């Protein structure tokens, strides 16, 4: 898993890979790691997919309950506080490193939660296994007040560094852009590893696998 987040001129840009490996074997090739938290708060997650989905869904329902109560849009500091409280209550057994990013009346906001509960608010953050190979790119190319196109090029490039140089990441680039009004989530922003050496479709004319006894049930 490799998740990056970049604060640009107005809003934030989050990116992630798609490969999910279940113990040294690629289980799914197009898993989605950019969850939803609010109309203006997205949350990438790295580590154990179980906890990353559980805590995100928990606080995502809590925020919805809350903004139905108050009536205002939800603040990213509330989501960050809920997440960090829950994570610290379990002493890191809930192993989900999260990148939480949204837009408020206070401008963009992009923070990162370690599995132990500690938070940092930075201009750009990266988490996951290929967090060292992706950060290497952001340090080399992040200038202040980038336009949306530049932030998306930068996030795609920072992901393609973890895609190619890390074994536990790759096969695609998920890039979501959050602004004050909208939030557009493009799934296949870049697919470098293209579908080479086409399949041969081995042909087995139905019946070659012997069957002993069959009960068909019409409905």
């Amino acid at each position: 898993t490799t998740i990056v987040g970049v604060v640009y001129r107005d809003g934030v840009v989050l990116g992630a890979d798609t490969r999910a490996t279940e113990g040294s074997i690629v289980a799914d090739k197009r898993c989605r790691k950019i969850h939803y938290m609010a109309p203006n708060i997205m949350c990438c997650g790295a580590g154990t997919s179980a906890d990353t989905e559980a805590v995100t869904n928990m606080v995502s329902s809590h925020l919805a309950l809350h903004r139905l109560e108050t009536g205002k849009q939800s603040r990213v500091l509330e989501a960050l506080t809920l997440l960090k409280r829950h994570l610290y209550r379990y002493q890191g057994h809930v192993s989900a490193a999260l990148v939480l990013g949204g837009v408020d009346v206070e401008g963009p906001f992009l923070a990162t939660i370690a599995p132990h509960g500690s938070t940092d608010r930075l201009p750009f953050v990266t988490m996951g296994s290929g967090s060292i190979a992706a950060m290497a790119q952001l340090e080399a190319a992040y200038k202040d007040n980038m336009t949306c196109e530049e932030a998306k090029e930068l996030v795609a490039s920072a992901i393609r560094k973890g895609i190619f140089n890390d074994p536990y990441s790759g096969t695609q680039v998920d890039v979501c852009v959050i602004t004050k009004d909208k939030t557009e989530l493009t799934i296949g922003y870049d697919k470098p590893n293209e579908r080479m050496y086409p399949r041969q479709e081995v042909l087995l004319p139905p019946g070659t696998t012997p069957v002993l006894k069959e009960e068909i049930r019409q409905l």
Partner: protein, 214 residues
């Protein structure tokens, strides 16, 4: 600090009627990074009709290759220029693997070569030297992916359909390419570029095939 390490990779051979297709992926990875994508230290040519393809730790196979090459050279010098056969090389390698039984080599090997009547045969070893001659075979981290696929298209068991004709060089090459393109998409440590060696009687030829670099 432990003197062992697994540098991933995989190899796979299919013996035919008068040829053998050997294949090894050119990719070398260390602890957590990726050292190289052009590692050619898997398939080592001992004699013009014999190769050894080994996986596991890279230093151990770079050592075992030299030990085998010098044993082959001694055999060639004592027997008046007579290049040993595949059977002799395979038995020699088993004997060599078992001598270092208490501080073993961390390699899994295949001695792929041609027999005397012209037929091609492959051998497969454990870490200590349990050799077994066979007609195909894969080793490495991608073993349990490729082996059952070849088991199903070669042995043609569990299919009530008369056995197809004998597979030639091109068909076997295409089948092995299928297997590697399928294993490069589900194993994290396998596949940046594979090298094929078609061993026939009028020498050997060599080809490359490119996979996903993720």
């Amino acid at each position: 600090w432990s003197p062992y390490q697994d540098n991933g990779g995989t190899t796979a051979a299919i013996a035919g009627k008068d040829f053998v297709i050997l294949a090894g992926d050119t990719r070398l990875n260390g602890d957590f990074c990726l050292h190289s994508r052009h590692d050619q230290s898997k398939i080592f040519q001992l004699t013009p009709y014999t190769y050894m393809a080994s996986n596991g730790m890279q230093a151990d196979r770079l050592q075992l290759q030299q030990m085998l090459k010098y044993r082959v050279k001694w055999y060639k010098y004592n027997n008046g220029g007579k290049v040993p056969s595949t059977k002799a090389i395979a038995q020699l390698m088993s004997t060599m693997l078992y001598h270092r039984r208490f501080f073993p080599y961390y390699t899994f090997n295949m001695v792929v070569g041609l027999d005397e009547e012209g037929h091609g045969v492959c051998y497969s070893y454990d870490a200590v030297g349990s050799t077994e001659p066979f007609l195909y075979g894969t080793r490495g981290s991608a073993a349990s992916f490729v082996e059952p696929l070849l088991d199903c298209l070669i042995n043609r068991q569990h299919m009530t359909s008369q056995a197809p004709p004998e597979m030639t060089k091109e068909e076997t090459l295409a089948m092995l390419k299928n297997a590697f393109t399928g294993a490069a998409e589900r194993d994290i440590y396998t596949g940046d570029s594979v090298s094929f060696f078609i061993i026939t009687k009028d020498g050997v030829q060599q080809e490359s095939f490119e996979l996903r670099k993720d």
